[PDB]
Amino acid sequence: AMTLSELPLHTSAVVESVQDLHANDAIARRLRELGFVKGEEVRMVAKGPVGGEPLLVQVGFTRFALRISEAKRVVVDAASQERRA
Amino acid sequence: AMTLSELPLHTSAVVESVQDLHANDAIARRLRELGFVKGEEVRMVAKGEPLLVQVGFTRFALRISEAKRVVVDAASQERRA
Ligand SMILES: [Cl-]
Ligand SMILES: [Cl-]
Ligand SMILES: [Cl-]
Ligand SMILES: [Cl-]
Ligand SMILES: [Cl-]
Ligand SMILES: [Zn+2]
Ligand SMILES: [Zn+2]
Ligand SMILES: [Zn+2]
Ligand SMILES: [Zn+2]
């Protein structure tokens, strides 16, 4: 499945779910609590793919800095991708 | 391959290497610089998160994704007090 860690710059996508990386995943839990839920749009604002980290992503009107390991928990719908040019 | 994230509580093991999770892995580079090198002994002192691991006289509080990068020798495991 495509994850947020692979979302190209200036591109939005619809969140499908947030998958635990391991048992009792506090990071995954925190992401869900912050708005990363099925049906909501998330966009890659800066850094990543390429460039490096952190990945600056936006949900609603709030921006978060995520390591690739953190963004990889968020599964997005690849066919919902749209370039915000 | 056995990783530090799998080292049981109060058990020690010898580091084999540090594996990148992705290309251009800065965290992996930091671990290598921190002393997680081939031949060094690492001990799981607190949990089995956070995973508190000790190298020498330094205690590192690692998350599982960070510890999973550190590969250890399975035959080198030792139960400690
Ligand atoms: Cl976590
Ligand atoms: Cl990462
Ligand atoms: Cl990194
Ligand atoms: Cl983790
Ligand atoms: Cl990480
Ligand atoms: Zn993929
Ligand atoms: Zn990274
Ligand atoms: Zn740090
Ligand atoms: Zn974790």
According to the 3-state scheme, what is the secondary structure of chain A? CCEHHHCCCCEEEEEEEECCCCCCCHHHHHHHHCCCCCCCEEEEEECCCCCCCCEEEEECCEEEEECHHHHCCEEECHHHCEECC
Instruction: Judge: A69–B21 Cβ closer than 8 Å, yes or no.
Output: yes
The CA B53 to ligand 3 mean position distance, Å, reads 19
Task: Say how many CA atoms lie within 13 Å of A15 toward its Cβ.
Answer: 24
Query: How far apart are the C-alpha atoms of B72 and A34, rounded to whole Å?
Result: 36
User: What is the interface size between A and B, counted as CB pairs within 8 Å?
Assistant: 17
Cβ under 8 Å to A: B residues 18-57: 21-22, 24, 26-27, 49
3-state class (DSSP) for residue B65:
helix
Asked if A11 contacts A43 with a C-beta cutoff of 8 angstroms, the reply is yes
Domain count, chain B: 1
Q: Is B78 annotated as a binding residue?
A: no
Please name the residue ranges forming H helices in B1-81.
26-33, 64-67
Query: How far apart are the C-alpha atoms of B30 and A29, rounded to whole Å?
Result: 26
Method used experimentally? X-ray
Q: Is B49 annotated as a binding residue?
A: yes
The β-bridge partners of A62 are: A59
Task: State the nearest Cα–Cα gap between A18 and chain B, in angstroms.
Answer: 16
3-state class (DSSP) for residue B46:
coil
Give residue for tokens 């949990």.
B47
Q: Which of B3, B12, B7, B2 is nearest to B80 (CA)?
A: B12
Bond before A54 cis per omega within 30 degrees: yes
Query: How far apart are the C-alpha atoms of A3 and B54, rounded to whole Å?
Result: 33
Token pair of B27 as six digits: 């965290």
| Residue B56 φ/ψ, nearest 5 degrees | 65, -125
Query: How far apart are the C-alpha atoms of B22 and B45, rounded to whole Å?
Result: 28
Task: State the nearest Cα–Cα gap between A66 and chain B, in angstroms.
Answer: 13
Which residues span the domain enclosing A43?
A: 1-85
CATH code for the domain of A53: 2.30.30.90
A68 near B CB under 8 A: yes
The CA A70 to ligand 8 mean position distance, Å, reads 14
Residue type, B50: P
Q: Is the dihedral of CA A64, A44, A70, A48 positive or negative?
A: negative
